[PDB]
Design a binder for this molecule. Structure first.
Ligand code: 7Y8
Ligand code: J23
Ligand code: CL
Ligand code: CL
Ligand code: CL
Ligand code: CL
Ligand code: CL
Ligand code: CL
Ligand code: CL
Ligand code: CL
Ligand code: CL
Lengths: 114, 114, 114
């Protein structure tokens, strides 16, 4: 899977080990091996949410399976909690788009997973 | 909804109020509440369009509904107009990808919209 | 089509002509005219792959058609080869998400391709 967070929070406010916490927490939540989890954090962005430049985040989670109604509700609670605790972003200023990818549409290591 | 613009135009060339202008114009175009509209502008990017590094933009609009044949033509006219007037980018050097998101696949405020 | 690479490799390690090289190789691989190929390279990113931050890349290819099982395997070999030879990124630390876009969902030049 891949998880991306784009935020206006400054780089200095991203705590050490944040990529590792995302990796481990997502491995547990999705059930996928940590070796297959990629994470990408983009601070200092020029962004607004509801017209306001207070701290916010736009995120995405792509996974081959492990995406659905109940699972995405659980992911949102986990990820909003982490963004609130670690980046001080209010959950009502976070979007997370979820993508259930077909294996044939995910390339890796000179091929695709299909 | 969420609107992202990636561009090679430098940050100093993005005028004041551009995030607000995008927020207001997208609220009217999509009909969605301004409170739910998120905007993200990424200048100074290493990009080419048609092999050329002249000013260009790659954009995306994600929305729960309000995406379709006619609506997307109207959004493209509005958004290319703004990128031309405000960033001086020619409309034939802009792509905008449109995504009609299922409510179950959009997280916000510790939950999803499903 | 549009190809985006996000990588932790620093900007100074992105060789001259890399955007043109991607444009040319993608024009041939997708069969599309190079005038329609857009490329975007984002170096210096805060990323981890499988828990570590050795060089890695998260990429996407969006195209109206020319996406499928066999084609995506071919694109992955081409693109991982280029990331390995030019950016020194191991193919097993690259993900590429493929998107077959409907023409009605791609805006360009004040309209869409539909
Ligand atoms: C069905 C769709 N892939 C198609 O035939 C096409 C090809 C080239 C450009 C287009 O806008 C659309
Ligand atoms: C159907 C679903 N995509 C599936 O069963 C799968 C699981 C794990 C890896 C993978 O590539 C594919
Ligand atoms: Cl970190
Ligand atoms: Cl589910
Ligand atoms: Cl898919
Ligand atoms: Cl929406
Ligand atoms: Cl129309
Ligand atoms: Cl969806
Ligand atoms: Cl590391
Ligand atoms: Cl195919
Ligand atoms: Cl589509």
């Amino acid at each position: 899977p891949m998880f991306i967070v784009n935020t206006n929070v400054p780089r200095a406010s991203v705590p050490d080990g944040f990529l590792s916490e995302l990796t481990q927490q997502l491995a547990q939540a999705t059930g996928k091996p940590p070796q297959y989890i990629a994470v990408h954090v983009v601070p200092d962005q020029l962004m607004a949410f509801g017209g306001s430049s207070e701290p916010c985040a736009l995120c995405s989670l792509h996974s081959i399976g492990k995406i659905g109604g109940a699972q995405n509700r659980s992911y949102s609670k986990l990820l909003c909690g982490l963004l609130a605790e670690r980046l001080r972003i209010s959950p009502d200023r976070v979007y997370i788009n979820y993508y259930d990818m077909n294996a044939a549409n995910v390339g890796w290591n000179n091929s695709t997973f299909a």
